[PDB]
Amino acid sequence: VQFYWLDLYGILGENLDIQNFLPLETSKFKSLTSEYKMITTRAFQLDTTIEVIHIPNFDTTLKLTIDSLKMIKSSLSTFLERQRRQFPRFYFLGNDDLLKIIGSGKHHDQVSKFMKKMFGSIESIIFFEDSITGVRSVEGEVLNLNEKIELKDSIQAQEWLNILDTEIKLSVFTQFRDCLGQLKDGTDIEVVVSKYIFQAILLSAQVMWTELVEKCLQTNEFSKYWKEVDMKIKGLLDKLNKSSDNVKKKIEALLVEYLHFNNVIGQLKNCSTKEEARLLWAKVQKFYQKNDTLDDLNSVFISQSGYLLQYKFEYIGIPERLIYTPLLLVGFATLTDSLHQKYGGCFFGPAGTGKTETVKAFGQNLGRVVVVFNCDDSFDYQVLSRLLVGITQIGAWGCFDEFNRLDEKVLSAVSANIQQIQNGLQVGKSHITLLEEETPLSPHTAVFITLNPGYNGRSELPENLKKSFREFSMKSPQSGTIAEMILQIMGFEDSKSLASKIVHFLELLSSKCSSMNHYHFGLRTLKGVLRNCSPLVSEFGEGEKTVVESLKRVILPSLGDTDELVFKDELSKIFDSAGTPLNSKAIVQCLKDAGQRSGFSMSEEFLKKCMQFYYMQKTQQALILVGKAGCGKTATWKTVIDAMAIFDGHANVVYVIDTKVLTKESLYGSMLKATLEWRDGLFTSILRRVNDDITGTFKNSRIWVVFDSDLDPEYVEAMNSVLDDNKILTLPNGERLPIPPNFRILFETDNLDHTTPATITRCGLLWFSTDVCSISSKIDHLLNKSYEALDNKLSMFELDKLKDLISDSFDMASLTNIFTCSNDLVHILGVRTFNKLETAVQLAVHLISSYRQWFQNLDDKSLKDVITLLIKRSLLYALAGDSTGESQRAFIQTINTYFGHDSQELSDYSTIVIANDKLSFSSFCSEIPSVSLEAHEVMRPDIVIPTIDTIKHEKIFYDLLNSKRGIILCGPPGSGKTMIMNNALRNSSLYDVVGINFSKDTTTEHILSALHRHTNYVTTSKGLTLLPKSDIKNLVLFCDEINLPKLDKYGSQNVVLFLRQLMEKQGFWKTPENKWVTIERIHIVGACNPPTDPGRIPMSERFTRHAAILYLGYPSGKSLSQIYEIYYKAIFKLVPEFRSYTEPFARASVHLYNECKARYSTGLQSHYLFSPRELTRLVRGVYTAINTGPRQTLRSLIRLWAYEAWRIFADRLVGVKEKNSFEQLLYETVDKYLPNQDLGNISSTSLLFSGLLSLDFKEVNKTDLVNFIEERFKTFCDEELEVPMVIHESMVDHILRIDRALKQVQGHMMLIGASRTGKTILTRFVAWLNGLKIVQPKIHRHSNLSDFDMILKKAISDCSLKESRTCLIIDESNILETAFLERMNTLLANADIPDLFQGEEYDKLLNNLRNKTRSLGLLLDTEQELYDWFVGEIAKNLHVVFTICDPTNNKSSAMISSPALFNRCIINWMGDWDTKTMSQVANNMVDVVPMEFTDFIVPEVNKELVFTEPIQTIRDAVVNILIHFDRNFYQKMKVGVNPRSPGYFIDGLRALVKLVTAKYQDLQENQRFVNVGLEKLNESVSLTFEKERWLNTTKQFSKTSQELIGNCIISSIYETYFGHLNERERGDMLVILKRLLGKFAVKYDVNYRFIDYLVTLDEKMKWLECGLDKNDYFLENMSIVMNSQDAVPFLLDPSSHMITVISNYYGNKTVLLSFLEEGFVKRLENAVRFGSVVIIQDGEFFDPIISRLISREFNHAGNRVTVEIGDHEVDVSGDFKLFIHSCDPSGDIPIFLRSRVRLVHFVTNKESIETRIFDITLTEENAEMQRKREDLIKLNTEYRLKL
Amino acid sequence: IPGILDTVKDLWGSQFFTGKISGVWSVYCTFLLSWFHALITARTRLVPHGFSKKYYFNDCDFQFASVYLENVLATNSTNNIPWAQVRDHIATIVYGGKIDEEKDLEVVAKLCAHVFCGSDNLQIVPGVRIPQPLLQQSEEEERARLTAILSNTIEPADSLSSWLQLPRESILDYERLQAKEVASSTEQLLQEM
């Protein structure tokens, strides 16, 4: 209730006290108060809702006050509705606006704050001390009101305004009458217009002439009136003067109309003109008027052709003056026609060439206010409906600008109501059901739909509405006549000749010009030119030269040299002696001096462009410059800041804002809700401060705001109220802040092509070319920059001396050609001069910064000698380092262009030789850690051997570090990314390096929170300077995958944006604290990989404009020996007698790598990526292997080595034949280096080493190893895993490999392979083996990544605070999303998710980790070290491993790219099962049962047996039969032979196995029975027929049993793969299996109708009785899989076949009963509990009825069925076996259950048709045959049973 | 598609009440308007050559003309109203709502040149057989007083297109195109008979 009281906090308080409210409501406010007094005075203390419901006696306080409250709250809305009903203009105001009005109803002055919502063309009410004297229109003219309108409290805002309504129109009516009283006598219009509203005066002016011409229309006159008109005009022309801007306008209107009369008369005069019947005057708009009326509104008449209308006299002042043309006038005529038929409009044509300007003009000419609606936007049509209540009550007009561009609800909502608007309009219904309410209709309202060239010219309007509208084909305005008429009106004495030229400067311009897409030459283009010409005339422009002067001043600056002389000639041909001289001296003096100061060359075009800009700062309120920051774009802006500060003597107070860095709210404001407060944003604080203290003090200081960004609607439309032209802040919160005329806005970009010209053209615009910056200018700047050096320690004395000394090198340097040659180098991102010069100088001056102490303390010759050598080196580096070393080699050949060291031939190039601080220097010889890594620290990451090139990287890095520059590398993870980086990092702790992780979803805020944790700030002056949390150390922030974050809607590099505002703008304008932030010693360095690659960002070049770059690639074979051999060097430290492997061991791996990488392309298979760190992986594995044994013989050396080698490389690959070739590559490489050991057994076997036994270098026979696990896994598989596949030598291989991984730190791995084909099970098993807690997700589609975040935080505490041992396993089917993945990506990246554990989690960690340190005896209250151990703990127990299958949408890399993951993760492509091990399984299976029945020898016959096991027995047969069965079934990619599961035939065998006893006993029992028949019979001996027949039956099956097994193997096809597999792959064995299982010797029956042979047909018969569609073989077979299928026969029923069948199957049986528990799906359980038959209902798709986690639970669940039985899956037996009766063919099935599911078919097709046809006709005559033979079948079975 | 006459005489039925107007010369012109209407619709049957666009000609506009005509019919029975100009704008205004090309403009202009006058008792199109003095006679009740009497002056092979002021050769042009069209239609069908 208190929020009603919050409403009423304001409102009741208000109207409680304001007794003025209706006494009913007032007394109700008081009845509130009878209790409300507690609601607020008691709640004065207890204010909030929860406190209000706790006030003393809230029991009656609320009750009674809330009773009254709700009475009131609703009464109040109806109270104001009452006011709205009483005064229709209130429907243009909100209810709350009326709350203000009624509280201030008395205060009519306060009421007037909503006056525009309450009226038409009125500016303000002219009143004094509670009484109105007149009103001023929006045009400036003032209507005197004849009666003083008292504003006495009691008159009510309601009637008050009603009074004015009448008062206004009355003084219009009657003063008009007065005025026409004079004018009708020929009185000079000036008189009465001085005293009155010109609009009405025009009416009379029109009347005067309309009537006057009648006598020329009598033919009596012609020239009299013609002359008389131009006599009157001449006087009026003389009158037209600036002296009264407003009256001037009144005159302009008058003259246009007099001209219209003149023209008509001109022809009446100059034509036979069939008197007033000739359209010449008959079609003309005529006015007549009279004072004889009972309603003043009827005093003037408007007519044309046979049409007559009455002017509505709504107060408009002088609002338009549209130049009318014959065409426009016709348009108006047609508009009135539609008024006659009460139809709405259909304007066809664009605004600015008409449309809006014409419908407005029209309405004004009729005299009634029209509400022009902007229809193309997200507007709540209910608001309109409310407006319409008022509109219809008023009789107001309404136009619909682009009406048809609506969504469906708005469109249809208004279609219904507009339908009624037009219905009721036609009907004349006084009360139209607007929103179903009988709304009063003032029969004057009208609907005006307008549309620019419609979408494809379409009648977009629904027919529902169209029936009541009329077409308005606007084709074109008459530009030149419009122009000319205006020029006449302008007082421009050349008018006509100007206009005739104007249209052709344009015509020619548009004709031959280029495709300046940003340019348009329409009607409004022309209008603009004139607007500019107008002041140019006042500035003494020489006639036609003024026109051209304008042309020089507008447009052409936005156009480029693509036209240049094209437009010169297109325009010059029209006027050749064109243009007046520009003499902007003080202006250019300020400008040019500003340039001289800044050091810009003051180039021609610079100054020219700047001068054009100057004209635009004068004339425009804003300008867009398309160009280049730092080159002219900002150099000019800079220059202008200065120039205008000087020129105006008014400091150019600019506020540069990088648009997208800040939000709209950041700039404008926001609000607080707890205590209710508006928050002032930056831009708006600026502007109010402009009024409060910028111009509030500096009355006319120039003030500027700059927006730096590219263009898109979303970030530019928000600036319109100032930016466009208004220059007045008009905020939605009412904060209006007229922005001083000295205020301007600059918008800088490089590309505007993102929206319409309708918006683009509204500004100044410079087509800026970057060649404004000559290189000589750039050089001039660089020389000046030497005096800006450098560090506080540098006085620059020695620098200035060096400047003079090096200034000589700028004299036509060979760089004038080298820069070209550097541009000729191969590179990825763009290369330009300013950054080339930047990095050259910044390094040079920081090289010189060392000359402040290394060489300042030495002489100048030392400064000279080394800076010459060193700067050449740095110049070479500046123009080399960023690209490929080979191109750098080519680059340094440019040394031969330099006349001193003119030699590209230098061996020890200046880049080979390194300079020392003592003036010494030398060729940088190899110092690569010879005696070095020997033992212990072998795997410690920071041991990566540094090499000469990386040292040189460090040499310069050091000075770049000194330079405070963010070098960005370009290369890959795994190629030294982290290695080099760390080597660099570890060289200087002075610089606090921070590894910032650039994930696709990393935000600036992530960066900022890190800074919050690690920084603070200082203020040497009130500047706000960022300082790391500790001083002295330099915070080198670091950026890793810069080109791998995401871009926004328009492809913007928003993280770069902020990167830049941090970098480029050096800081941040505190939008919390409203203050510019600078930085102290925070630095930043970045990196990336080649932008050319998939998923990488094409980097902003303005970004790169100030960047330094270093290319990173892979190491050479020699250098691999130099680095990795050291790692191997270390390893051999422990085995001196075999240490000799030294070099060849390393070199084998070096060269094997070289080729391996070459051998395996990504063209073969994507993820085939290679890195030198794989050699480290060899180092890793090998060293630890060494640590387990006693001596490393060379055989033992290489066996461990080689077996490891393929685990590192081959295991990541797919192609098995290719792997074979690698075996040889491997083999041969080691054959090259260490061939004297047993390479045969080592490479040919896939032999494993002791694991279950201590390693100790020992090989274990895989057989034996298997023998070990044959026992080990029986215990670890504690009757829980539930899968019985056979541990092939590969399976035990998997086992060894996965465990080793499980025994390593940082257990980060990817397993790629088939769905639950042991790759899963495998991991479950080793969990039993090793004993770790395992992370396994269970996701249903209602979860999200915050659930994940819980889990993450959970897990990190589980590892470190809970102190548990685990392993995190990632399930691809549960991958919720990217951000989800991003957490885990950074998790691995820096072994952390920065601030995941911040805030209260951090604090809980501080508390509980300290609690642990107390229990641990640690003194780690040092929060740093404390959380350092926290994360150290986690890393030793988390071990994230990911498992993946490839049947879906995961990026083809089998992961979503992530190069960072690529150089960290261990990978193993598991893939699929081997055909020989599957026969192993099969062997084991058949070994269980008596397949070997003696009747059978070697049974199949009809073909295939090639290369099988010598077939002697039945198990021999059956297995090899099944090998060719499923090897050929299947082959050829229909579903896809390249990848498929084997399960399909595995369980096929299982069934066959079942049948070895099922059918066998069928037979054996039958044998008993024929024996039984023979028993008596043998001695019955009457007949022999029966006896012998029995003997014959034994004879039959004695052969047929075997014949049958041949046929039985083919029967299994139906279950095996047949039911999904289609022709290309189905048909590889479809009937071919019958044709091929063969050779093994027993008959194939060419007949294979297993629908008969496998089952007794009567079950199907009963299903046929139940509606089973017998049609297709496998269709009707589904009734059998219904009655026998284990993998759920998903009842796919779009056809709903099974609804029929199951409902008839159901019959007299009820729905379901036995196991009877809901579990987690009561939705189904409670829908089936009834007793007997059901499936999962009918059409009952899973997503509705069942959750996703049922997969596993369906298969089995200990939460549903107990172990006292042993079962886990619920007892939902056959009749009620809940098969998913779903009509969804795409039902949610993951790429693991797509295998584990029996998808079932239920639909008919074309293949049946033909027979259906036959059948019909066949049986139509021959059914009798069928009747007979089917009856015989019946009888035959009778006899079979009789037998 | 029915005949032009069908359109004319049936239109008169749908416009039954129009001739109730005291303007007996107005119902005279009403007859003319329907003759006009049918003919222009016959031309739209020939889009884009007998008329460049499928413009929605209709009986509401038929009636809008009766209003616009009524606006001038106050004196149009006499020479006070130059109905040649009236013709011009019944076309451009009543029937020109969303007409876009000047060619169609002229097309219609020719038709109205061949259809309207403000005086009764005149010859309009003798090809239709209209030199009639039908005056105080309804478009429906007195159709057959003189207008249903007019016989079938329509060629089996031509509308006449000369009633529409269109050439046989354009009919022939279309005919060749029709062959191209129906043949190319079978081109796809034909792939299997």
Determine, for residues A473 and B89 on separate chains, whether the beta-carbon distance falls below 8 Å. Answer: no
Report how far residue A838's alpha carbon sits from residue A850's, in angstroms, rounded to the nearest whole number.
19
Q: Is A925 annotated as a binding residue?
A: no
Main-chain phi, psi angles of B30, to 5 degrees: -60, -40
Query: How close is the nearest chain B Cα to the Cα of A686, in Å?
Result: 53
Using the structure block, give the residue that is written with the tokens 């500790």: A1030
Distance of CA A464 to the CA centre of its chain: 38
Rounded Cα distance, A583 and A1761, in Å: 99
Phi/psi at A1458 (5° precision): 30, 85
Residues 6+ apart with CB under 8 A from A1725: A1716, A1717, A1718, A1719
Kindly give, in sequence order, each residue whose CB lies less than 8 Å from that of residue A1137, ignoring residues fewer than 6 positions away.
A1191
Give the separation between CA A1085 and CA A1108, rounded to whole angstroms.
Answer: 9
CA distance B102 to B89: 14
**Orientation angle between helical segments A1399-1416 and A1423-1435, nearest 10 degrees:** 90
Q: Are A681 and A670 in contact (CB under 8 A)?
A: yes
- Residue B48 preceded by cis peptide, ω within 30: yes
DSSP conformational letter for A646:
I
Closest residue, chain A, to B60 (C-alpha): A467
Phi then psi for residue A163, to 5 deg, are -65, -50
CA distances from B97 to A403, A469, A751, A1238, B11 (A): 19, 11, 42, 98, 21
Q: Collect all residues of chain B within an 8 Å Cβ-Cβ radius of residue A471.
A: 97-98
Contact A1269, A1287 (CB under 8 A): yes
Contacts of A592 by beta carbon, 8 Å cutoff, 6+ apart:
A602, A607
Go through chain A and tell me how many residues it has: 1843
Separation between Cα atoms, residue A259 and residue A485, nearest integer Å: 9
User: Which is it for the CA torsion B71, B75, B80, B86, positive or negative?
Assistant: positive
Q: What type of residue sits at position A1332?
A: L
Dihedral of alpha carbons A811, A815, A816, A817, sign: positive
**C-beta neighbour count of B90 within 10 angstroms:** 26
B41 to chain A nearest CA, in Å? 18
B81 min Cα distance to partner chain A (Å): 6
Query: In angstroms, rounded to a whole number, what is the distance separating the alpha carbons of residues A630 and A1064?
Result: 11
Among A1351, A1362, A1364, which residue's Cα sits nearest to residue A1411?
A1362
User: How far is residue A680's CA from residue A1072's CA, in Å, rounded to a whole number?
Assistant: 10
DSSP string, A820-875: HHHHTS--SS---HHHHHHHHHHHHHHHHHHTTTTSSSS-HHHHHHHHHHHHHHHH
| Sequence-separated contacts (24+) of A134-138 with Cβ below 8 Å | A134/A171, A135/A164, A135/A168, A135/A315, A137/A197, A137/A315, A137/A316, A137/A317, A137/A318, A138/A317, A138/A319
Distance from CA of A312 to the nearest CA of B (A): 22
CA–CA gap between residue A789 and residue A809 (Å, rounded): 19
Structure tokens at A367: 């005299």
How many whole angstroms separate alpha carbon A335 and alpha carbon A360? 12
Are A955 and A847 a contacting pair, CB within 8 Å?
no
In one-letter notation, the amino acid at residue A84 is: R
Name which of B71, B92, B99 is nearest A306 (Cβ-Cβ).
B71
Between chains, do A348 and B99 touch, taking CB under 8 Å as contact? no
Q: How far apart are CA A1786 and CA A1792, in angstroms?
A: 15
The burial class, CB within 10 Å (0-12 / 13-18 / 19+), for A515 is exposed
Closest residue of chain A to B95, computed from CA coordinates:
A471
Residues A1702, A1733: contact at Cβ < 8 Å? yes
What tokens were used for A383? 């608001």
Contact residues, chain A, for B81 at CB < 8 Å: 277
Q: Is there a contact between B97 and A472 if contact means CB atoms under 8 Å apart?
A: yes
A471–B contact, CB cutoff 8 A: yes
Considering only CA atoms, which of A138, A85, A114, A127 is closest in space to residue A369?
A: A138
Q: Which residues of A1708-1731 are buried (b: 16+ CB within 10 A; e: fewer)?
A: eeebbbebeeeeebeebbebbeee
Residue A340 forms contact with B (CB below 8 Å) = yes
CA A571 distance to own-chain centroid: 46
Helix axes A633-644, A585-598, angle to 10 degrees: 120
Assigned token pair, A519: 């340019």
What is the DSSP secondary-structure string of A185-232?
A: TT--HHHHHHTS-HHHHHHHHHHHHHHHTHHHHTTS-SHHHHHHHHHH
Closest CA to A1324 of A1275, A1254, A1364, A1276: A1276
Q: Which positions ≥6 away from A943 have C-beta within 8 Å?
A: A933, A937, A1127
Q: Do A475 and B100 touch (CB under 8 A)?
A: yes
Q: Report the chain B residue with the minimal C-alpha distance to residue A476.
A: B100
Tell me the Ramachandran region of residue A540: left when phi exceeds 0, alpha when psi lies from -120 to 50, beta otherwise.
left
d(CA A1207, CA A1464): 16
Q: At what angle do helices A408-427 and A381-394 cross, to 10 degrees?
A: 10
Mutate to test the interface with B, among A305, A327, A342, A343 (most CBs of B within 10 A): A305
Give the chain B residue whose CA is nearest to the CA of A308.
B71
> Which residues of chain B have a CB within 8 Å of the CB of A305?
71-72, 89
Query: What is the DSSP code (8-state) at residue B91?
Result: I
Beta bridge partners of A1313: A1471
Q: Rounded to an integer, what distance in angstroms lies between the CA atom of residue A1051 and that of residue A1038?
A: 24
Check CB contact under 8 Å for A341 and B72.
no
Of A307, A470, A473, the CB nearest to B100: A473
Q: Is A346's Cβ below 8 Å from some Cβ in B? A: yes
Which amino acid, residue A1077? V
Distance (Å) from the alpha carbon of B114 to chain A's nearest alpha carbon = 21
User: Residue A466: exposed, middle, or buried by beta-carbon count in 10 A (0-12, 13-18, 19+)?
Assistant: middle
How crowded is the C-beta side of A1225, counted as CA atoms within 13 Å?
22
Backbone angles phi, psi at A1026, to 5 degrees: -70, 130
A196's tokens: 């009155």
Q: Is the CB of residue A110 less than 8 Å from the CB of residue A127?
A: no
Long-range contacts of A86-90 (CB under 8 A, 24+ apart): A86/A158, A87/A157, A87/A158, A87/A161, A87/A162, A88/A389, A88/A390, A88/A391, A88/A393, A88/A394, A89/A117, A89/A118, A89/A119, A89/A161, A89/A390, A89/A394, A90/A118, A90/A390
The two beta strands, A1689-1692 and A1798-1800, are parallel
Three-point CA angle A1476, A1480, A1483, nearest 5°: 130
- Whether B98 sits inside 8 A of A471 (CB atoms) is yes
SS3 of residue A47 by DSSP: coil
A1478-1482 LR contacts (CB < 8 Å, sep 24+): A1478/A1542, A1478/A1546, A1479/A1519, A1479/A1520, A1479/A1523, A1480/A1286, A1480/A1288, A1481/A1285, A1481/A1286, A1481/A1546, A1482/A1519, A1482/A1522, A1482/A1523, A1482/A1546, A1482/A1549
Q: How many CA atoms lie within 13 A of A1705 on its CB side?
A: 27
Q: State how far residue B100 is from chain A, nearest Cα, in angstroms.
A: 7
- Experimental method of this PDB entry: cryo-EM
Find, in chain A, the residue whose alpha carbon is nearest to that of B80: A277
Instruction: Find out whether A1666 is annotated in a ligand binding site.
Output: no
Is residue A1638 a contact partner of residue A1644, using CB atoms and an 8 Å limit? yes
Dihedral sign (CA A938, A943, A944, A948): negative
Q: Residue A1602: how many CA atoms within 13 Å on its side-chain side?
A: 21
- DSSP characters for A342-369? T-B--EES-TTSSTHHHHHHHHHHHT--
Ramachandran angles phi, psi of A719, nearest 5°:
-100, -5
Asked if A334 and B93 come within 8 Å (Cβ–Cβ), the reply is yes
Identity of the residue in A278, A306, A337 whose CB atom sits nearest the CB atom of B72: A306
Is A1181 annotated as ligand-binding? no
Given an 8 Å threshold on Cβ–Cβ distance, is B98 in contact with A334? no
Using the structure block, give the residue that is written with the tokens 């039954």: B16
A602: left (phi over 0), alpha (psi -120 to 50) or beta: left
Place of tokens 């499928």: B54
Question: Taking CB atoms and an 8 Å cutoff, what residues of chain A touch B55?
Answer: none
* Shortest Cα–Cα distance, B131 to chain A (Å): 27
Chosen from B26, B62, B69, B98 to mutate, greatest number of chain A CBs within 10 A? B98
Question: In angstroms, rounded to a whole number, what is the distance separating the alpha carbons of residues A1319 and A1795?
Answer: 15
CB contact under 8 A, A305 and B64: no
Q: Which H or E element spans position B185?
A: helix B168-189
Counted residue by residue, chain B has a size of 193
Cα dihedral A729, A732, A733, A734 sign? positive
Look up tokens 């690569």; give the residue.
A928
Reduced to 3 states (helix: H, G, I; strand: E, B; else coil), residue A1343 is coil
A1346 exposure class (CB count in 10 Å sphere: 0-12, 13-18, 19+)? exposed
Strands (E) in A70-208, as ranges, are 122-128, 131-137, 142-150
Q: To which H or E segment does residue A1239 belong?
A: helix A1239-1244
Segment (H or E) for A657? strand A653-657
Tokens of A558: 């936005």
Distance (Å, whole) CA A1148 – CA A1228: 9
- A341 in B contact zone (CB under 8 Å): yes
DSSP strand pairing (A1309-1313 vs A1366-1371): unpaired
DSSP H helices, A1245-1286, are 1262-1276
Whether B135 contacts B120, CB under 8 Å: yes
Nearest residue to A65 via CA among A96, A45, A89, A41? A41
Task: Determine what percent of chain B falls in helix, strand and coil, rounding each to the nearest 5.
Answer: 55, 0, 45
The minimal CB distance from B82 to the residues A274, A470, A473 is found for A274
Angle (nearest 5°) at CA A430 between A425 and A431: 100
CB A411, CB A375: distance < 8 Å? no
The answer to whether B68 contacts A282, with C-beta atoms less than 8 Å apart, is no
DSSP state of A1736: B
In this structure, what token pair is assigned to residue B135? 């005056």
Closest by Cβ to A341, choosing from B64, B80, B96: B64
User: Resolution in angstroms, to 1 decimal, for this deposition?
Assistant: 7.7
CB contact under 8 A, A475 and B68: no
**SS3 category, A535:** helix
Residue A630 is assigned to a ligand binding site: yes
Instruction: With CB atoms and an 8 Å threshold, state whether B80 touches A278.
Output: no
Question: Which chain A residues have a beta carbon less than 8 Å from that of B70?
Answer: 306
Do the annotations mark residue A350 as ligand-binding?
A: yes
Q: Is A286 helix (H, G, I), strand (E, B) or coil?
A: strand
CB contacts of A332 in chain B (<8 Å) are none
Which ranges of A691-810 would DSSP assign to H, the alpha helix? 720-723, 757-760, 775-785, 797-807
Tell me how far apart the alpha carbons of residues B44 and B51 are, in angstroms, rounded to a whole number. 5
With contact defined as beta carbons under 8 Å apart, do A433 and A420 qualify? yes
Instruction: Pick left, alpha or beta for residue A941 (phi over 0 → left; psi -120 to 50 → alpha; otherwise beta).
Output: alpha
Kind and range of the H or E run holding A614:
helix A604-619
As beta bridge partners, residue A1691 has: A1781, A1800
Q: Which residue is closest to A341 within chain B, CA to CA?
A: B64
b/e A1448-1466 (16+ beta carbons within 10 angstroms → b): eeeeebbbbbbbbbbbbbb
* DSSP code of residue A1020: S
Closest CA to A700 of A685, A713, A710, A690: A690
CB of A1667 within 8 A of CB of A1700?
yes
**A274 neighbourhood in chain B, CB within 8 Å:** 82
For residue A88, which phi and psi values (nearest 5 degrees)? -50, -30
* Cα–Cα distance, A556 to A579 (Å, whole number): 13
> Could you tell me which residues come within 8 angstroms of residue A554 by beta carbon, excluding any fewer than 6 positions away?
A528, A529, A532
Residue numbers in A near B89 (CB within 8 A): 305
CA A457 to chain centre: 33
Query: Closest to B67 (Cβ–Cβ): which among A340, A470, A471?
Result: A340
Put simply, the answer to whether A471 touches B68 (Cβ < 8 Å) is no
| Among chain A residues, CA nearest to B57 | A471
Name A708's bridge partners. A748
In one-letter notation, the amino acid at residue A352 is: G
Query: Residue A659: what residue type?
Result: T
CA nearest A952: which of A975, A982, A984? A984
Q: Which residues of B touch A278 (CB under 8 A)?
A: 82, 85
